Design an enzyme around this catalytic site. Structure first.
Site, PDB file in Angstrom:
ATOM      1  N   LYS A  43       0.837  -1.196   0.000  1.00 19.42           N
ATOM      2  CA  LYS A  43       0.000   0.000   0.000  1.00 19.42           C
ATOM      3  C   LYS A  43       0.871   1.243   0.000  1.00 19.42           C
ATOM      4  O   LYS A  43       1.881   1.281   0.699  1.00 19.42           O
ATOM      5  CB  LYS A  43      -0.890  -0.002   1.256  1.00 19.42           C
ATOM      6  CG  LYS A  43      -1.633   1.294   1.554  1.00 19.42           C
ATOM      7  CD  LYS A  43      -2.791   1.509   0.597  1.00 19.42           C
ATOM      8  CE  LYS A  43      -3.383   2.903   0.730  1.00 19.42           C
ATOM      9  NZ  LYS A  43      -4.422   3.192  -0.314  1.00 19.42           N
ATOM     10  N   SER A  44       0.481   2.267  -0.767  1.00 16.50           N
ATOM     11  CA  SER A  44       1.184   3.547  -0.740  1.00 16.50           C
ATOM     12  C   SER A  44       1.196   4.050   0.691  1.00 16.50           C
ATOM     13  O   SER A  44       0.134   4.207   1.306  1.00 16.50           O
ATOM     14  CB  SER A  44       0.498   4.590  -1.622  1.00 16.50           C
ATOM     15  OG  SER A  44       0.608   4.272  -3.003  1.00 16.50           O
ATOM     16  N   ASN A  67     -13.516   5.267  -5.632  1.00 14.88           N
ATOM     17  CA  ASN A  67     -13.028   5.258  -4.263  1.00 14.88           C
ATOM     18  C   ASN A  67     -12.428   6.576  -3.845  1.00 14.88           C
ATOM     19  O   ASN A  67     -11.925   7.347  -4.668  1.00 14.88           O
ATOM     20  CB  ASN A  67     -12.003   4.146  -4.074  1.00 14.88           C
ATOM     21  CG  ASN A  67     -10.582   4.619  -4.333  1.00 14.88           C
ATOM     22  OD1 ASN A  67      -9.940   5.214  -3.462  1.00 14.88           O
ATOM     23  ND2 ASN A  67     -10.086   4.359  -5.528  1.00 14.88           N
ATOM     24  N   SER A  68     -12.472   6.827  -2.545  1.00 12.94           N
ATOM     25  CA  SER A  68     -11.697   7.892  -1.966  1.00 12.94           C
ATOM     26  C   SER A  68     -11.125   7.424  -0.632  1.00 12.94           C
ATOM     27  O   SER A  68     -11.501   7.934   0.419  1.00 12.94           O
ATOM     28  CB  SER A  68     -12.547   9.123  -1.786  1.00 12.94           C
ATOM     29  OG  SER A  68     -11.772  10.170  -1.241  1.00 12.94           O
ATOM     30  N   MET A  69     -10.213   6.460  -0.689  1.00 10.23           N
ATOM     31  CA  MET A  69      -9.721   5.808   0.532  1.00 10.23           C
ATOM     32  C   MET A  69      -9.016   6.793   1.469  1.00 10.23           C
ATOM     33  O   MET A  69      -9.247   6.789   2.681  1.00 10.23           O
ATOM     34  CB  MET A  69      -8.789   4.643   0.190  1.00 10.23           C
ATOM     35  CG  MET A  69      -9.404   3.538  -0.659  1.00 10.23           C
ATOM     36  SD  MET A  69     -10.788   2.681   0.122  1.00 10.23           S
ATOM     37  CE  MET A  69      -9.923   1.834   1.430  1.00 10.23           C
ATOM     38  N   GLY A  70      -8.178   7.659   0.905  1.00 16.09           N
ATOM     39  CA  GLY A  70      -7.471   8.667   1.695  1.00 16.09           C
ATOM     40  C   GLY A  70      -6.147   8.180   2.262  1.00 16.09           C
ATOM     41  O   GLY A  70      -5.729   8.630   3.334  1.00 16.09           O
ATOM     42  N   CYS A 130      -1.702  10.263  -6.217  1.00 12.10           N
ATOM     43  CA  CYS A 130      -2.874  10.025  -5.351  1.00 12.10           C
ATOM     44  C   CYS A 130      -3.901  11.148  -5.500  1.00 12.10           C
ATOM     45  O   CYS A 130      -3.582  12.309  -5.240  1.00 12.10           O
ATOM     46  CB  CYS A 130      -2.526   9.862  -3.875  1.00 12.10           C
ATOM     47  SG  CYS A 130      -4.039   9.577  -2.895  1.00 12.10           S
ATOM     48  N   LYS A 164       4.675   5.977 -10.173  1.00  9.74           N
ATOM     49  CA  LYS A 164       3.268   5.728 -10.524  1.00  9.74           C
ATOM     50  C   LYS A 164       2.688   7.048 -10.987  1.00  9.74           C
ATOM     51  O   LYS A 164       2.632   8.013 -10.218  1.00  9.74           O
ATOM     52  CB  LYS A 164       2.497   5.216  -9.320  1.00  9.74           C
ATOM     53  CG  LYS A 164       1.005   4.971  -9.528  1.00  9.74           C
ATOM     54  CD  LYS A 164       0.725   3.696 -10.284  1.00  9.74           C
ATOM     55  CE  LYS A 164      -0.747   3.317 -10.241  1.00  9.74           C
ATOM     56  NZ  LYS A 164      -1.135   2.738  -8.927  1.00  9.74           N
ATOM     57  N   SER A 195      -5.735   5.904 -10.893  1.00  5.39           N
ATOM     58  CA  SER A 195      -7.151   6.098 -11.169  1.00  5.39           C
ATOM     59  C   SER A 195      -7.402   7.324 -12.031  1.00  5.39           C
ATOM     60  O   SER A 195      -6.643   8.295 -11.967  1.00  5.39           O
ATOM     61  CB  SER A 195      -7.908   6.312  -9.864  1.00  5.39           C
ATOM     62  OG  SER A 195      -7.506   5.370  -8.883  1.00  5.39           O
ATOM     63  N   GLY A 250      -7.866  -1.414 -15.892  1.00 10.32           N
ATOM     64  CA  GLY A 250      -8.875  -2.083 -16.685  1.00 10.32           C
ATOM     65  C   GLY A 250      -8.619  -3.540 -16.975  1.00 10.32           C
ATOM     66  O   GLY A 250      -9.280  -4.119 -17.829  1.00 10.32           O
TER      67      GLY A 250
HETATM   68  C1  LIG Z   1      -9.431   0.693  -3.149  1.00  7.11           C
HETATM   69  C2  LIG Z   1      -8.309   1.269  -3.967  1.00  7.11           C
HETATM   70  C3  LIG Z   1      -7.169   1.762  -3.347  1.00  7.11           C
HETATM   71  C4  LIG Z   1      -6.125   2.302  -4.088  1.00  7.11           C
HETATM   72  N1  LIG Z   1      -5.016   2.764  -3.465  1.00  7.11           N
HETATM   73  C5  LIG Z   1      -3.908   3.108  -4.176  1.00  7.11           C
HETATM   74  C6  LIG Z   1      -2.599   3.390  -3.550  1.00  7.11           C
HETATM   75  O1  LIG Z   1      -2.450   3.300  -2.297  1.00  7.11           O
HETATM   76  N2  LIG Z   1      -1.570   3.742  -4.353  1.00  7.11           N
HETATM   77  C7  LIG Z   1      -1.691   3.829  -5.690  1.00  7.11           C
HETATM   78  O2  LIG Z   1      -0.696   4.140  -6.379  1.00  7.11           O
HETATM   79  N3  LIG Z   1      -2.855   3.572  -6.331  1.00  7.11           N
HETATM   80  C8  LIG Z   1      -3.972   3.223  -5.653  1.00  7.11           C
HETATM   81  N4  LIG Z   1      -5.176   2.938  -6.318  1.00  7.11           N
HETATM   82  C9  LIG Z   1      -5.138   2.979  -7.783  1.00  7.11           C
HETATM   83  C10 LIG Z   1      -4.812   1.601  -8.351  1.00  7.11           C
HETATM   84  O3  LIG Z   1      -3.464   1.267  -8.032  1.00  7.11           O
HETATM   85  C11 LIG Z   1      -4.950   1.577  -9.870  1.00  7.11           C
HETATM   86  O4  LIG Z   1      -4.006   2.517 -10.415  1.00  7.11           O
HETATM   87  C12 LIG Z   1      -6.344   1.937 -10.384  1.00  7.11           C
HETATM   88  O5  LIG Z   1      -7.368   1.357  -9.556  1.00  7.11           O
HETATM   89  C13 LIG Z   1      -6.518   1.494 -11.835  1.00  7.11           C
HETATM   90  O6  LIG Z   1      -6.409   0.068 -11.970  1.00  7.11           O
HETATM   91  P1  LIG Z   1      -7.728  -0.860 -12.136  1.00  7.11           P
HETATM   92  O7  LIG Z   1      -8.474  -0.359 -13.347  1.00  7.11           O
HETATM   93  O8  LIG Z   1      -7.167  -2.252 -12.251  1.00  7.11           O
HETATM   94  O9  LIG Z   1      -8.508  -0.604 -10.862  1.00  7.11           O
HETATM   95  C14 LIG Z   1      -6.227   2.363  -5.572  1.00  7.11           C
HETATM   96  C15 LIG Z   1      -7.373   1.863  -6.187  1.00  7.11           C
HETATM   97  C16 LIG Z   1      -8.415   1.329  -5.441  1.00  7.11           C
HETATM   98  C17 LIG Z   1      -9.643   0.813  -6.147  1.00  7.11           C
END
Ligand SMILES: Cc1cc2nc3c(=O)[nH]c(=O)nc-3n(C[C@H](O)[C@H](O)[C@H](O)COP(=O)(O)O)c2cc1C
Ligand SMILES: Cc1cc2nc3c(=O)[nH]c(=O)nc-3n(C[C@H](O)[C@H](O)[C@H](O)COP(=O)(O)O)c2cc1C
Lengths: 311, 312
Positions: A43-44, A67-70, A130, A164, A195, A250
């Site tokens: 996790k970041s 999402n907006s996990m924070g 982020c 990233k 995202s 995706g």
């Molecule tokens: C619940 C959740 C938490 C995420 N937390 C991080 C994070 O901590 N660090 C990060 O670089 N990206 C985070 N992302 C982005 C994902 O790494 C990824 O770049 C994004 O969801 C696109 O990939 P996907 O289409 O497979 O979801 C998060 C995405 C989700 C859904």
């Protein structure tokens, strides 16, 4: 053969979790390690632990997720200790994502990683994208600020690392971003993409947004992002010939993974689909990608990586 | 019950219109839009001289939307001005024209030509700050200094209320920065959110080949891909520019999506990809579906719920 040989490591296959999915706790990381994935990423993290944004902060959608996990995380010390003491490197290599909320914080964090990278081979992905921390915009959308992070992190860490990136949507931005990245020889890989930032989902039944933080605004993942991810992967694959590109966005199937690799991806990250399905997805992904290669006569990923055809 | 919208000095029968670029390039296209059940229509983004646009294939329909790199094919500004001045039946519905000059000098010349026709006929301007498909011409809307320049020069040359078509933003700082520029221009009366999500890439796994020819396969995305982005942009500017109207564009295939745009703050709702797929009969369906949702919720007018999205 699905093997990838990069950064001095042998990866059994190109698949790993996207940062933030199935990687926050010791148990999460155990499950990723036990999975069929070729690698995993933590996790970041931030210098101090965070509990993140208030609930609800995640919503699964028919076409993906918002999402907006924070940045909820156990703090840098937890992930470093995991990297130093707990992780089984005989299973697979380990990446850690770091997302300090200021350049100073990021510098403090990467300095701590140095001895562990030297001893254990832990790989750094610096998060410049982020989109869910109120008051902290994406660093990757300001090229002067990006240049500052990369300078200070390159100097402080002094070893190869990756970044990233947020998704870009303008050819001039691909050019400007690549121009900054190409000034930093220690940036050996680029992960495209984080995202699609600050989307809004509204429930027509109760006329209310589906997540609490930031008036409903959150990062989009899943099927929404595939063409954006592929574009970013390919654009940097072409502009940054002495760097690797990792694809993220995706991926739900071997077919999407194949497309990412064709666009230029060395590793393929899985977020939303992994959140939906659990770590069994990696077994399915290996099987599906192998089938495609078998049908096409490709012996190795090298035979088609980055070989997308244009008209 | 009523779908009527009173804005910009007009009564619109309903909030629906085409998105610029779809069913609006030729005289025949514009006739079909005028004959449709749409509340309004907008002309293809035009340039000072005619353009035939990019080589084929330049459009590809997808299960979740569309990808295109049309390249601003259009009959040139004089054609659309002549349509606006002599051909369009304003008794059916009001007319917008989209203008997308490839330099600020070109845009200034175009909008000057529009002034007398707006004065005479009431034709409305939408200034396109966001075409993502002309090689070597980046989105003006992604450079806030350049955007300020266009808006200054166009405000000065046109001198009447007009609107802007914005590219989608993905960062809160960008909503803030964009709004700070737009809020300095009192003639900017409406903001259309959003243009395509720019420079996506679609590849066919069977032949390992991109699906459109221009720009190595890179093209703007429309349709289901863009709804949450469009809603976010609509709502962000609805809140940040309280003295302006917002029009929604992106991801509308049904009355349900239209309802969401309006809830987010949209005064008018534009339809692109879905219209390209279905043809102008879509407007009759959209009116019916939106009324059905309103009936079920007990709403008599759009004013009852426009901009009333709830947060937690
Ligand atoms: C619940 C959740 C938490 C995420 N937390 C991080 C994070 O901590 N660090 C990060 O670089 N990206 C985070 N992302 C982005 C994902 O790494 C990824 O770049 C994004 O969801 C696109 O990939 P996907 O289409 O497979 O979801 C998060 C995405 C989700 C859904
Ligand atoms: C074939 C095609 C041509 C387009 N041409 C224009 C144009 O000339 N001017 C413009 O502002 N937007 C243009 N766009 C963008 C649309 O107006 C709209 O912003 C976008 O497609 C998102 O709406 P949708 O999801 O309903 O497709 C075009 C889109 C398509 C699919």
């Amino acid at each position: 053969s699905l093997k990838v040989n990069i950064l001095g490591h042998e990866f059994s296959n190109p698949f790993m979790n996207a940062a933030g999915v199935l990687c926050t706790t010791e148990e999460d990381l155990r499950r990723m390690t036990e999975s069929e994935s070729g690698s995993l990423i933590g996790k970041s993290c931030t210098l101090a632990p965070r509990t993140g944004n208030p609930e609800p902060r995640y919503f699964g959608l028919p076409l993906g997720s918002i999402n907006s996990m924070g940045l909820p995380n156990l703090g840098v010390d937890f992930y470093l200790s995991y990297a130093a003491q707990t992780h089984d490197y005989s299973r697979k290599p380990l990446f850690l994502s770091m997302s300090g909320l200021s350049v100073e914080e990021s510098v403090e964090m990467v300095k701590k990683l140095v001895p562990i990278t030297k001893e254990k081979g832990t790989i750094l992905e610096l998060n410049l994208s982020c989109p869910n921390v109120p008051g902290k915009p994406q660093v990757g959308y300001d090229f002067d600020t990006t240049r500052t992070y990369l300078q200070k992190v390159s100097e402080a860490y002094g070893l190869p690392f990756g970044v990233k990136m947020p998704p870009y949507f303008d050819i001039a931005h691909f050019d400007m971003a690549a121009a900054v990245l190409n000034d930093f020889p220690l940036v050996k890989f680029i992960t495209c993409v984080n995202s699609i930032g600050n989307g809004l989902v509204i429930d027509p039944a109760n006329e209310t947004v589906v997540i609490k933080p930031k008036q409903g605004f959150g990062g989009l993942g899943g099927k929404y992002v595939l063409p954006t991810a592929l574009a970013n992967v390919n654009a940097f694959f072409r502009r940054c010939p002495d760097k690797l590109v990792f694809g993220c966005g995706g991926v739900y199937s071997g077919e999407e993974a194949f497309l990412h690799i064709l666009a230029g991806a060395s590793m393929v990250q899985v977020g939303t689909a992994l959140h939906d399905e659990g770590p069994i997805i990696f077994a399915r992904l290996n099987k599906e990608l192998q089938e495609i290669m078998t049908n096409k006569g490709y012996k190795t990923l090298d035979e088609f990586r980055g070989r997308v055809k244009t008209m």
